[PDB]
Design a protein around this motif. Structure first.
Motif, PDB file in Angstrom:
ATOM      1  N   UNK B 128       0.814  -1.212   0.000  1.00  0.00           N
ATOM      2  CA  UNK B 128       0.000   0.000   0.000  1.00  0.00           C
ATOM      3  C   UNK B 128       0.852   1.268   0.000  1.00  0.00           C
ATOM      4  N   UNK B 129       2.043   1.188   0.588  1.00  0.00           N
ATOM      5  CA  UNK B 129       2.936   2.343   0.658  1.00  0.00           C
ATOM      6  C   UNK B 129       3.588   2.660  -0.688  1.00  0.00           C
ATOM      7  N   UNK B 130       3.728   1.641  -1.532  1.00  0.00           N
ATOM      8  CA  UNK B 130       4.258   1.825  -2.879  1.00  0.00           C
ATOM      9  C   UNK B 130       3.211   2.467  -3.791  1.00  0.00           C
ATOM     10  N   UNK B 131       2.329   3.266  -3.193  1.00  0.00           N
ATOM     11  CA  UNK B 131       1.282   3.966  -3.932  1.00  0.00           C
ATOM     12  C   UNK B 131       1.322   5.472  -3.685  1.00  0.00           C
ATOM     13  N   UNK B 132       1.901   5.872  -2.557  1.00  0.00           N
ATOM     14  CA  UNK B 132       2.105   7.288  -2.261  1.00  0.00           C
ATOM     15  C   UNK B 132       3.267   7.831  -3.071  1.00  0.00           C
ATOM     16  N   UNK B 133       3.320   7.431  -4.340  1.00  0.00           N
ATOM     17  CA  UNK B 133       4.448   7.737  -5.213  1.00  0.00           C
ATOM     18  C   UNK B 133       4.123   8.793  -6.272  1.00  0.00           C
ATOM     19  N   UNK B 134       4.213  10.062  -5.879  1.00  0.00           N
ATOM     20  CA  UNK B 134       4.088  11.190  -6.809  1.00  0.00           C
ATOM     21  C   UNK B 134       4.068  12.541  -6.088  1.00  0.00           C
ATOM     22  N   UNK B 135       5.225  12.945  -5.572  1.00  0.00           N
ATOM     23  CA  UNK B 135       5.367  14.271  -4.980  1.00  0.00           C
ATOM     24  C   UNK B 135       5.371  15.314  -6.096  1.00  0.00           C
ATOM     25  N   UNK B 136       4.268  16.050  -6.221  1.00  0.00           N
ATOM     26  CA  UNK B 136       4.119  17.062  -7.271  1.00  0.00           C
ATOM     27  C   UNK B 136       5.004  18.290  -7.055  1.00  0.00           C
ATOM     28  N   UNK B 137       6.164  18.083  -6.435  1.00  0.00           N
ATOM     29  CA  UNK B 137       7.135  19.155  -6.228  1.00  0.00           C
ATOM     30  C   UNK B 137       7.898  19.469  -7.513  1.00  0.00           C
ATOM     31  N   UNK B 138       9.221  19.359  -7.445  1.00  0.00           N
ATOM     32  CA  UNK B 138      10.068  19.613  -8.602  1.00  0.00           C
ATOM     33  C   UNK B 138      10.193  21.087  -8.931  1.00  0.00           C
ATOM     34  N   UNK B 139      11.022  21.785  -8.162  1.00  0.00           N
ATOM     35  CA  UNK B 139      11.299  23.197  -8.404  1.00  0.00           C
ATOM     36  C   UNK B 139      12.785  23.485  -8.192  1.00  0.00           C
ATOM     37  N   UNK B 140      13.086  24.560  -7.467  1.00  0.00           N
ATOM     38  CA  UNK B 140      14.465  24.909  -7.129  1.00  0.00           C
ATOM     39  C   UNK B 140      14.509  25.618  -5.777  1.00  0.00           C
ATOM     40  N   UNK B 141      13.656  26.632  -5.635  1.00  0.00           N
ATOM     41  CA  UNK B 141      13.558  27.416  -4.413  1.00  0.00           C
ATOM     42  C   UNK B 141      12.127  27.384  -3.900  1.00  0.00           C
TER      43      UNK B 141
END
Lengths: 419, 419, 419, 419, 74, 74
Positions: B128-141
């Motif tokens: 079930x934990x292998x589903x929280x896979x997609x941090x919509x982050x990806x920036x710099x600052x």
């Protein structure tokens, strides 16, 4: 195969100069249209002219319909989205050509045999080897002509992305665009600080540095970029800072600016696939036109492989190979930090060599500038080289090898030039 | 969802470079078409090529109809009005994928449960934990704009969990929260007493220490904590005590209090898996809100591996890698005592280095603060450092290395600070 | 599960103090009766009272029939044969509870998902982990008090079964009653003679020793016990004796007495299962009331496993685990002789450590006092320790470690004390 | 038999401690009920619990009816008048189990025979023997009284089979009857000649020696027995003899007599399985009543294993284990020559130890008297021990260890006594 | 090997020499094998080629770093 | 083996000796196998030949490079 066949025909009708970049004969193409489309297309080249709709339809004026009519020549040229897949398609057309003759020479043996069937297996052997025509080999030219270019012609100063170390750039002339350099070394050698240094030096030469720290946080990477920029003491700030350091706020209120006035981009997602970094590289390259991009990775081994259930030695290969492709196809400097086999510390000369790249096999091969780091004052408490890291370029594909020495300031994570 | 699924496939067939900007597997798509439309689409990318109708239909030349025929690929590429909603649709597809597996893992438990349903809730947990896979982050600052407010919060001292040795904490500033420190050393160096010291020192700074002694008993660990706390003689108590020692009952009736007035928790189950420790760590962290937790392990090697039938060198890797994850995902200091190769005693300098971590390979790599212990008066009867243990920090990921000296009181199992 | 459920409810109605020894909630029990039988049972303990038919029926006077009437309470109480299984059942009751909620939280996800199904996997994760707290967990002080009970009663002589070696019993204070000691060593170290020594020494302190020699005969074990008791020469007797030795008949007509006047019992059936030894231990313990029993085994590996068709490394585990259980549940000293990996002789220091227990994994864990034997004058013809066996206690769960030296008389199979 | 089967199952459900006092497997009980009544009954014991109705019914909650329902367990428990006949009944069940498998192994042969039916009678023999069950418990008396005899009957000389070396028999007192000795050594040490010496020495003490030479021929073994017996020169005879040696015909016409007047039997079949040697041993022991038999093997490694497709290290175990059994169950001295790891010659002291028995693991364990051979004048051209083999007894189960020196006459293959 | 046949086929009558700039950078046959066995697998194979294909095989190699810890660096 | 039968067949009555200039340069039976097992596969097979074909089998071999790091090069 008609699909890849169309692309080839069309992409050539689009760029009437590609018939040269890929050699074929009408024998490769389907009967009728595609056949005549090339037969007449190739003839116009041997007669020393250009190959376009206008000229083709001008050649066979009466027998134009046998090429699908003019309305087809245009349909083919329209079918080709971009003439970049030409190679890949000109190979799919070539593979299927061997395929066709491989059968034609196989069912050839059967009918030929039935005179002892010996000279058959002999004659049918020389023909089968003629199907071993390489598209990739080792010829003469293409290079000699490009051996020219501006390089030999004219130049001074660094062409590519400067490392920030005068004695190193005097060997590389800036990490190129398709290169894949490797900064490997044992733990506690400045492996990270050496990277964070080149990170800024490139951001000062007005280039973009994408730092992918999978091991550390977006914070510590800055905390280090500051303690390195202002030359402030690393231990001071940590916790003391407030009521322990003075007059350093000048060097601080200056570094804080530098880092925010820099082109450093830090990604710190836990699990990063080579494809993830790829996406974030296009994006950064798209948002930033005209400028060069460098992609740093704080641990080649902490990268997430493509096939979870695979041998470890194959994963590092899957990564390495993919990483190179990125640099080549995206045209950006790819710098990847790595680690060296723990087996280095069980020798007399603690100096790293290529073989020390443990698991990674397809690694040293896909790397362009393998550079190991070595602090002598780690293994020897009484070294004649006090606080001296020696960057060891063990592999340069388009340049020379050798060792470069730099002064390592343990307290500021800073590197100083020499010579 | 088929609607958003079309948009994704199509927008990729239009922009053959989008397959990278959004990671997926055929498992996300509907059966048959959409599935094969991606499977073959993905393959061509892994082989380092392009992805367009022409190339796709060129790949599966005979098995093209299984992708809806060519007339479908074009319909998909025509269905996409603009490739701007690609992100939105590549998410709609990604959400529906989790949903598909959330059920697949829910109706998994049901059937699975029906031995004890414990290993179920455990196996059904890691999936079930292998589903929280997609941090919509990806920036710099973003978290980078917050690295100035904790430089002014640099009040005074020790940010993390203090070791209790003034000269050591002046380097680490308290073992952090995600760190995985390693206290390795040869037998008879204080390896254990050094641990049981930091154990209390933390329980005095009002933190929780979970001591997992797989070697000793819940008693001896206390019997040692007492003989260390009251400074009473170790040999006295053992047996003599009653009719051999006097005026020590003051130091005893005081220590017995300290230990019971401490936050030390001791687990002594014979066979402990990293997952066992994990469960007991959540529990301790749940019962104790707001406070930091430290997990000590008295023998990295005495831990029970996950796969019984596996190579020894792989077990220590399985453990090591797992131990780190725990510290990271559970946000607690993980301290694991270890042992060093017997090969250390066959040298002139008995001083341990990293390579001395024998079998363990993925060990030194997952460790944040590898610190070896060394008593010189063990190998030398006439040492200039009488009763002096020197803690050797051989690896610090977010800090510096170096050696720290402490006075070892063999009789009380106590450690004293120096200059 | 209703069967175990009854046992729990009953045994409580029998021991109105067990509600504390096992924590539950009405939720655990079947609907209606069992539910109310606990809800009203628990209520009475929270309000600080006692739980018995009298009290329960006293509480819910008018609503007593909803508990199956008074006649049921009595029936439940009568159903419990012995409140010994209470734990086992209170666990069966508990296991089924997790299973009930596991499904409840599983079919929970399905309905929950069909908002993004992310917070689902998250909420459905916290619950699945919040299913562990039911039995015995982690604490401390309840032993502290006991760690102190044994401090003031530290009189000073041996509490348990004496080894017969002054310098060894000054560490163990007699092998306890639940302990499982391991006497392992290489061939030709006195491994057996050292056992046959402790064998008598215990029979002299009026304890019973069951010697299970699976390798030797009921005779040689005696022949040795004699040559060791009378101090007569081992070689003399064998064959010479009659017409070769004189005035030894005094030492012989004395030993033969000692051995027949001892509490040594020797079993020599070829194939002995851990269960065989078990049966013979009950029997011996039954026939001999009041007195302690020690069970020795001449070869841990020559024991017959439970599952013939199983991996060797699992057999030694099956044995080791079972052997400990016997010592615990039967309350007898279990001493098992073992052998060390042949790999010991390929080092520079022939001194055994724990890792040298080859196959046996679950071995070192289940042992309480691992003690290796080492004769230095076997590997070195010119040893400064002529005729000296050094007993090496490598593991003591309720005590300290260290090496104890004894004088081995090769000729009499006798061991002598030192210092 | 179901009547006695109930009593056993019942008396156990009454006394949940009797499952230990009599060993069985579900295979003993009738199908369905009685079977499951024990299968689930036994499991609960292996998991370290109790065995009563309440506990069993608790285990198989849903699958209870397959044990005859709860109403059957009670009926069984009630069917037992007194748990005194348990032994008597536990034997009635056991006898019927052998009977069941006696048939299954009988009708096994029939179907099996239908490759040579030799290995059938062999494999069908090993099974039929795993059924002989005769014993009880143990005291000491009955055996104690026999330890005397050999004192009164100890007339002073070798009890067992003499080696022929005065200084060796003064340690062993003749290889016993169940012993399994091992004569291992490096090539060219007299490994074979040392064997062929003891071969005759035993044939002179009027014993039977079965020499199994799998490496050499029936001839060379005799040719060596002659050159050793008559003391004639080994090189002379070979080819020269006729017209090269004189007056030796006296020593020849004497040796040829000795060998033919000896009890030496030589088997030289190429591929010999341990079972082959077994058969030939019974045969030799049957034809020769009253006299002792010794079985020599010229190469433990040249023996044919039982399982062709198995790991080498397991084959030598299969052989070794089998070889011992033979000596034990057939009551004959088993001497097996062997070879030592080639690793011996890469050390400073070329003197063999037990760890030098390479692959063989279960080897050193099953051996009673491992004796290595060592010629010092092989590794050293200038040895102070010119022509001196030293027999090194490295393991003696019922005796002492140590090195015995003998003079080796390279020319006659003869060994001489010393001291 | 393949690139040698090809070059030898396209060029009849003339001799062919195969140079290799690093014997150690060559890719072995068995990836999962001991390093000392890989160089043996390569070396043995390299010879066969020269023999069976009848061409001069020149292979550059490297010497143990142990050479620089002596008095005679030869 | 084959070339030994053939030579032994064409030449009746006379003894045959089979020399091999390199035990290690012989081609193993199982290509994908451990090196140490290949020489075992060869050695064992070579003996069988001598025995079953009844011919002298002489095989030249090479010694470990480890011989030159001792005092007695013997």
């Amino acid at each position: 195969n008609e699909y890849a066949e169309q692309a080839v025909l069309g992409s050539i009708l689009t760029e009437p100069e590609l018939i040269k970049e890929c050699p074929l004969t009408p024998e490769h193409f389907s009967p009728g249209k595609h056949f005549n489309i090339y037969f007449t297309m190739q003839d116009l080249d041997r007669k020393g002219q250009s190959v376009d709709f206008t000229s083709i339809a001008a050649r066979v004026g009466e027998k134009l319909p046998q090429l699908g009519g003019f309305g087809y020549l245009t349909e083919l040229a329209a079918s080709v989205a971009s003439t970049t897949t030409f190679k890949q398609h000109c190979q799919t057309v070539s593979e299927y050509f061997q395929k066709r003759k491989a059968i034609s020479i196989a069912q050839q043996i059967i009918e030929n045999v039935n005179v002892k069937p010996i000279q058959e297996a002999v004659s049918e052997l020389m023909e089968i080897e003629a199907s071993g025509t390489d598209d990739d080999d080792g010829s003469i030219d293409e290079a000699l002509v490009t051996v020219y270019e501006e390089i030999e012609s004219a130049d001074g100063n660094i062409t590519g992305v400067p490392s920030g170390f005068t004695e190193l750039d005097r060997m590389t002339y800036g990490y190129k665009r398709r290169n894949f350099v490797l900064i490997a070394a044992r733990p506690s050698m400045g492996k990270t600080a050496f990277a964070l240094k080149q990170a800024k030096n490139m951001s000062d030469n007005d280039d973009v540095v994408n730092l992918h720290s999978l091991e550390m946080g977006k914070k510590e990477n800055i905390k280090r970029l500051i303690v390195t920029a202002g030359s402030i003491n690393a231990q001071k700030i940590k916790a003391a800072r407030r009521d322990f350091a003075s007059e350093d706020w000048g060097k601080l209120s200056m570094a804080i600016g530098e880092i925010s006035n820099s082109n450093i981009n830090i990604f710190d997602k836990a699990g990063q696939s080579v494809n993830y970094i790829w996406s974030k590289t296009r994006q950064t390259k798209r948002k930033n036109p005209g400028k060069r991009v460098i992609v740093m990775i704080d641990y080649l081994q902490l990268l997430e492989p493509a096939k979870a259930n695979d041998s470890r030695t194959n994963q590092i290969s899957q990564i390495s190979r993919d990483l190179k492709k990125m640099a080549r196809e995206l045209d950006v400097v790819v710098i990847a930090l790595s680690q060296l086999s723990r087996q280095v510390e069980q020798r007399q000369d603690k100096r790293p060599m290529l073989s020390d790249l443990r698991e990674s096999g397809q690694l040293e091969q896909d790397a362009d500038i393998i550079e190991f780091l070595y602090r002598d004052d780690y293994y020897d408490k009484e070294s004649e080289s006090k606080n001296i890291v020696e960057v060891i370029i063990a592999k340069h594909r388009d340049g020379p090898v050798g060792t470069v020495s730099l002064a390592f300031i343990k307290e500021y994570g800073n590197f100083v030039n020499l010579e």
